[model samples]
Target: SKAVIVIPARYGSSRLPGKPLLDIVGKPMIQHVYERALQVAGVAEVWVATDDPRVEQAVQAFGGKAIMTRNDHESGTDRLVEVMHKVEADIYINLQGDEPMIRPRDVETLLQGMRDDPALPVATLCHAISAAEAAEPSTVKVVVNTRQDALYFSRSPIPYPRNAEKARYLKHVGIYAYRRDVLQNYSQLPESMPEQAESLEQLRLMNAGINIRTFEVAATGPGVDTPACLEKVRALMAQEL
Candidate 1:
C-alpha cells in the first residue's frame, strides 16, 4: 500500500503564532519536520499542507512540496483530507509540522503496521512518560488495553493510582496514520462530548466506535508549542550539531 505523509502546518497558533516558521537551529521548524519526514522509509511522498501563502513560499524555498489548504479547517485531519483529494494514496500519515524531533524509525513502524493490517482505520504512537510529565495537561495521556487498542486519552492522569502499584503513564504522541476510507468518512462522524471536553480529536473516532491501534516507541522527542518549548528544542538540536 502506498503511504504519504501530510504535515498540517497552520500559521496561526494561539500560544506561538507562526510556529511552523519559527527558527530552530538555523532552520524553520516546518523545514526540520519536512526533512525528517523525507528520512522515513516506505513513504511515497511528503507534502506540507498549509493555509498561509507565506508558509507555502517558505516550503517552496526549501524545495519541499507544499499544498495550499483552506484556513477555515478546524483540525489537522481536515487538512489531511483535503490533501488526499489532491494526492492519491492508500494511507495518509498526519505528522504535525511542529514535531521536528520525530523519529523516522517510529514513522516506519507505523507505516509497516498499516501495511500489515489492511483493516485498521487509524493508528498512533505513544511513549512512556514520567508521572510528573503526565500530570501536565499539555502532555496527553493514554491508556491501552491488552490488544494495544487505546481505551481512553485525557489531559488528566488516568487510573487515578488509587491503591494501584507502579502505574505506568503513556504520553500520546501527536502523530497519526489513517487509511483512505477513514479520512473520507471522518467528517461525517458526529461530534463527541469527550472530544469536546478534552480537546482531543481522536476521541471523536473512539466515540464513533473506530478502533485506534496504539504503538509504543522507545522514546519521543519534544514538539514545539510555546516559546519555552522552542528554546528547549533549539538547545536539544544544537547538542547534536
Candidate 2:
C-alpha cells in the first residue's frame, strides 16, 4: 500500500495573507511544511496543492513538487480530491500547510494505524489538551469509544464537565489520512447539521455513518493561523536552530 502526503496551500488568508510564502526562520512557510512531510516514513511523495501561481512557484523554488488546483475549492479536502485524481495512491494523508510544526512521528503513527487496519476508511490524530484549552471553542474536541472510533467532534466542550474535576479533553489535530475510495467519494457525502453548526467538515463523515478512527499523539506543535501564532512558531523553531 502506497501513501502520499498532499498539503493544501493557499496564498490568501484572512488573518495572514500570502501565508504559504511567509518567511519563517529562513525559508518560506510552505517549504518548512514540505520538508517536514519528507521526513515522514513510508510516504511515496509529498505535493503542495495550491490555487495560486505564486504559491505553486514558491513550492517549485524550494525544489518541491506542487500541483496547481482550482481556487474555487471550498475546503482543503476538496483540493486533496483534485490531487487524488491526478496522482494514484492507496492512502492519502492530508497535512495542513499551516502546520509547519507538524510532528513527523505523529504522522507516522496515523500511517501505522491505517496500515494496521486496511478497513479503516479514515483516521486522524488528537492529543490531550488542558481543560482550559478545551473550553476555548477554537480548539475542537473529539470524544471516542473504547476502540478509539470517534463518537463526535465539536467546537463546544464535550462531555460537559458535569463533575468539572474529573474531565479530560482531547484536541483534534487537523491532520488526516483517507483511503483512496473515501477521498474520491468525499464530496458526494451529504452535509450534516453538526458539521454545518460547528463548521467542521469531519462531522459530515460521522453523520454519514462512516467511522473515523482517532489516534493519540504525545503532543503537537502550533499551527500558524495568526500573526501572533507565526511569531510563536518562529520562536519555537528558532530554538531548534
Candidate 3:
C-alpha cells in the first residue's frame, strides 16, 4: 500500500504559460497540488518532475521536493519513467499539477482500488456527470462494464444519446496510479491508433492489452489550464479562506 505522488509540471503550457507558477491566493498553484499530495493517506513522499529551473526553484522555495527531468519527454508518462529510476516505490501516482482541488480521499481511493486487485496494473478516478458536463467535449466521458473495467474513454458524449432514456455518464478524472514495474515499461509501450485518434495516452495502455480499472470517487474541482480557470479556482480558494 505504499505510494509516491509524482506531479508532472511543465513550464510551457499552450493555454496558460508558466501555469504551475501562477499565484492562487498567496501560494503558487503547484504548491497547492503538492500540499494535497502530502495530505494523501498512504503516500510516503511527493515529488514534482519539471524541466524548468524556475519550477524547480519554486518547489524548493516552499520546502517541497522537485526533480529536473529531460525536456525531450513527449508526454507526462515519459517524464515519469525518468523519475521512476530516481525514486523507488511500490506504487506511483501521476497526479496532474493543474488540479488544485484534487482531494486526499480521492487519491487514497485510487490507491486502494489498485491494492484491492494487485494484478491490475493501472487505475484511475471518475464521477457522475451532469447533462451539460456530458455534452461538453472538454469533459472526458467514460463507460464502464459490469465489473467496473473501462470500456472506453472519449471527449465526445458517449452512448450517442439516441435514446430518450436517461443514461448515466461518468466524467473521467485524469489522476492515474501505476504499479512500479508496470510504469517502468510505460515508455516502451507503442502509441496505438485509438490513443493517437483521441490524444489520450491512457488509450495506448488499453491498446497494448493492459486493463485499467476505473474507480468512482467524489466529483473533483476544475483544474487550472487557462487564465479564467485560474481565476475561478482563486475565487473558490478565497471563499474557503
Candidate 4:
C-alpha cells in the first residue's frame, strides 16, 4: 500500500511563531523531524505539509519534500488532510514538527500496532511517563484497556490511582498514525464535547466511540513548543552532534 508520513509545519502558533524554521543547533526544527521519520521502516514517503513559504523553502533547501497547504487550517491534522488530496500515500502519519528527538523506531512500532489490528481506525504513540510528568496538565495522560484500546485521554490526572495503586498510566506521545480515509474524514465529524472540554482532539475520537490502538513507548521524546522547551532541545541537539 502507498504509505506516507506528513509533518505539518506552521509559522503562526501563538506560543512560538515560526516554530518550523526555528534552528535546532544549526538545522531547521522540522527538517530534523522529517529526516528522523524518513528512517522509519513502514513509511514509504516523508513530506512536510506547511502553510508558510519560508517553511516550504527550508524543507526544499534541506533536500526534503514539502507541500504547501492553506494557512487557515483549524489544526495541524486538518492541514494534513489538505495534504492528503495532493499526495498519494495510503497510510498517513501526523508527526509533530516540534519533536526533533522523535525516534524512527517508534514510528515503525506504532504503525505495526495498527497493521496488526484490522478494526482499528487510529493508533498513537505514548511512553511510560515519570510521576512528575504524569501530574503536569501539559503532559497528556491516557488510560488503556487490556486489548490496547484507549479508554480515555485527558490532561487531568487520569485513573486517579487512588485505590488500585497498580494502575498503569500511560503518557501520550504526539505522534498519530491513521488510515488515509480516517485522516481525511476526521474533519467531517462535528467537534465533540470530549475534545472541547479537555482541549484534546484525541478525546473526540474516543468519546465518539472510535477505538485508538496505542503503542507504548518507554521513553518520552522531548518536544520544543515553548522557549524553555527550545533550550532543552538545544541541549539534546548539542549532545547528538
Candidate 5:
C-alpha cells in the first residue's frame, strides 16, 4: 500500500515554453514541485514523468527521480497513466508541475480521503471562492452534490447567481489522486463532449460512469500557468524564505 505522486512535465507550454525548466528564485520550477511532493507524509515516492530530455535531465540533475514517458500525451492525466503502468502503487497522485506551491499537508489530505473511503475511484481538492474569483474564467469551478461527489466541473461560474452577492463557488484544484485500476481504465473511456467543451479531462471519467470525490480545503498559493502567474509564485516563494 503506497501513495505515489507523478508530475507531468513538458518543456513546451503554449503560454510559457520550457515552463518546467523556468527558474524560480534559485531552483528550477520542476524542482519546487518535486520537493513539495517529497514532504507529503503518505507519498512513498515522487516521480517526474516527462517526455522531454531537458525536463528529465533537470530532475536527474537535482537528484530526484524521473520517468521518461511518451510526448504524445494530450493531457497530464495521460502522462500520469504512463507512469502508473511503470510504477506500482495503491494510490497514484497527478500533481501538476506548475503547482510548485502545493502544500504537502493538502496532498496528504487527498490521500487520507482515499484511505477513508475505499470505494472512491478518484478524489481531488476544491476551495471556497468569492464572487470575484468565480467571475474569472481562469478559475475552474466544481459543483458537488450532498455525497461530496463532483456533479460538474466548468470554467464558467456555476450556480449562476441571481443573487451574485450571496453566491459561493468551489474553485477546483488541479491536483488529483486515483487508484491504479481507475487510472489505467480512465484513458480507455470515450472522451465526453463536456470534456471537449471545457477542455477538462476529469469529465471523461464522470461521463463514463465513474464517481470522483471532492474534498474542500483552504485556498493555496498561485500556480505558474502564465508568465504573470510565475511572477506571482516567485513573490510568494520569496516571502516563504
Candidate 6:
C-alpha cells in the first residue's frame, strides 16, 4: 500500500495569522514544510491540505500540490481526511503545517512502528522527557503501556511519581499516521471526555478506547508558533535546513 503525506496549512492561526505564508529563508513556511515532508522515505507523494486560497497559491508557487478543503474542518486531521478523498492509500500521514523541522529519520521511525503492528489503527511519536519538560504542559505528556499503547494525553503532569525513582514521562509529538479506513472512521467519532478536559484531541481517541501507538524518539525538533519561534527557526535555517 502506498503512503502519502498531507500538510494542513491555514492563514487563520490565532497566534500567528497567515503563518503558512510567513517568510522563512525567502520561502513560505508551508513550502518549507512541503520540502521537509518530501525527505521522508515512506511518503510517496506530498500534498498541502488547505482551506485558504493564499495558502494554495503559496504551495503552487513552489511547484507543490495543494488540495482545497472546507474551511469548516476543526483540526488538521479533519483537513487531512478531506484531502484523502482525492488520493488512494492504505496509510495516510498527518504532517503538521508548522513542523518543517520534522526529521526524515523520525518519519521513517514512526512508519516502521506501524508496519510492525498492522492492527494498530493509529500511530504517533513520543519520547522520554526530563523532569522540567514533564512539568511543561505545552510539551503534552503521554503514559503508555508495556505493549506501546497510549493510556492518556494531558496538559498536566501524569502518572504522578509516588516513587520518584521510577517516574518516566513521555512527551507527545504532533504527527500521526492512520489506516485509511481507520482515519475515515475517526472522523465519525463524537467528541470525547478526556479530550474536553485536557484540551488535547488525541486524548479523545484514547479515552474512547482506541489503541493509539506512539513510537519513541530521542528529542523533538522545534515548531513555529510565535515571533520567538521565528527567530529560532531563522537560526535553524542558518545552521542547517
Predicted candidate 1 versus true structure: per-residue lDDT over 176-226, tens digit per residue: 999999988987999999999999989999999999999999888878888
Summarize candidate 5's per-residue lDDT along 1-241 as a digit string, tens digits: 6889899997889999999999999999999999989888977899998889989988999899999999899888888888888899989999989988889999888999999988898999999988888989778999999989999999888979999777779999988999888977876799899889998888888898888899999988888888999899999899999
Report the Cα RMSD per candidate.
1.2, 0.9, 1.2, 1.5, 1.3, 1.4
> In order, what lDDT does every prediction score?
0.91, 0.93, 0.90, 0.83, 0.90, 0.83
Across residues 113-211, which tens digit of lDDT does each residue of candidate 6 receive? 777878888999998888778898787998888888887788888879788888988899999988888777776788877678778888767756778
Candidate 6: which stretches are off by over 4 Å? none
lDDT of 2 by residue, 97-130 (tens): 9989888988999999999998999999999999
- Best candidate per lDDT, number? 2
Candidate closer to the true structure by lDDT (higher is better), 2 or 3: 2
Model 2 residue 113 lDDT?
A: 96
Give the Å error, residue 94, model 2. Answer: 0.3
Looking at model 1, report the run of 10 residues with the lowest lDDT sum.
Answer: 158-167
Greater TM-score among 1 and 2 belongs to 2
> What is candidate 3's TM-score against the reference?
0.96
Q: Which stretches of candidate 2 lie over 4 Å from their true place?
A: none
Instruction: Show pairs that collide, candidate 1.
Output: none
Q: What is the lDDT of residue 107 in candidate 4?
A: 87
Per-model TM-score, in order, reads 0.96, 0.98, 0.96, 0.94, 0.96, 0.95
User: What would the per-residue lDDT of candidate 4 be over residues 185-217, giving only the tens digit for each residue?
Assistant: 777778888789889987777766778888887
Is candidate 1 or 6 superior in lDDT? 1
The numbered model that scores best in TM-score is 2
